[PDB]
Each structure stands twice: as C-alpha cells, then as structure tokens.
C-alpha cells in the first residue's frame, strides 16, 4: 500500500499554478508508473484529499484511482457513536451524576451522550 497523504495538492492540478511549474514533469511520471505499458500487480495506491477538484483528472479516472470513498460530516446517529467512542465506562464518574442511575454507569453515560447530542443539534 502506497499512501499519498494530502493528495488534494499532490504535485498539482495539471496546467495550473503560477508560482510552480513542477507539475508538467511530476504528474506524467506518476501517471505512467500506474497503468502504463507495464502495470503493477498487487500494489494499492491510497490518497487522502480535502479538495477533490484540485487533483488532476487523468489520475482520478478508473484504472488508477478506482474506489472513491467519501466521508461526510456526522449526523446525530453518527455523533452518538462517535461520542461513545470516547466516553467509555472507565472514566471517573461523579457520584451525584450516578445518583439518578443507581450506579449504572453505562446507562448514565448513554443518557449523557443523548443529552449532549440533543444540545449540540438543537
């Protein structure tokens, strides 16, 4: 696996960039290494980007970057899971906060997560 972190500005959007012109030589090399005359067998190229439009189109076409995975901003249902990923039942929990749950830490944490989500998405 070859991971190109920050692929959004990776080597250019070809034919763009006033300050730098390294694109015309760096982009074709990568375009020829992947899906060239001789092709790789078991190599996976993974890129992460914040600006999809800023990546050159010739590399985004199928055969070079096949599977396009989009991550969206979480909704309430995803926010509940994300909060559960951090508010584990191992944190020091206040006794007065467990008073209304009779010591049931998991249920208390679930209710706190629900209240937090409701407040944040009100």
């Amino acid at each position: 696996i070859v991971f190109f972190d920050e692929m959004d500005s990776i080597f250019r959007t070809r034919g763009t960039g006033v300050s730098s012109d390294v694109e015309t030589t760096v982009v074709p090399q990568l375009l020829s290494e992947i899906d060239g005359v001789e092709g790789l067998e078991n190599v996976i190229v993974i890129g992460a980007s914040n600006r999809e439009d800023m990546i050159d189109p010739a590399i985004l076409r199928p055969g070079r970057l096949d599977v396009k995975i989009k991550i969206e901003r979480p909704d309430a249902e995803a926010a509940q899971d994300i909060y559960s990923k951090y508010l584990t039942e191992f944190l020091p929990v206040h006794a007065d906060d467990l008073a209304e749950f009779d010591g049931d830490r998991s249920a208390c944490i679930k209710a706190m997560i629900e209240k937090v989500v409701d407040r944040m998405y009100a």
Binding site: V18, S19, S20, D21, V22
Partner: peptide
C-alpha cells in the same frame, strides 16, 4: 515571484590509490 530548479555542474576531481 517565481520558483527555480537547479542543474548542477560537476567539478573535476582526481586521486591516486
């Protein structure tokens, strides 16, 4: 306001043994 790329010019060097 522009960027440049360098091409080197090698200098002669010779040593014995």
């Amino acid at each position: 306001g522009s960027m440049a790329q360098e091409q080197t010019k090698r200098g002669g060097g010779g040593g014995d043994d």
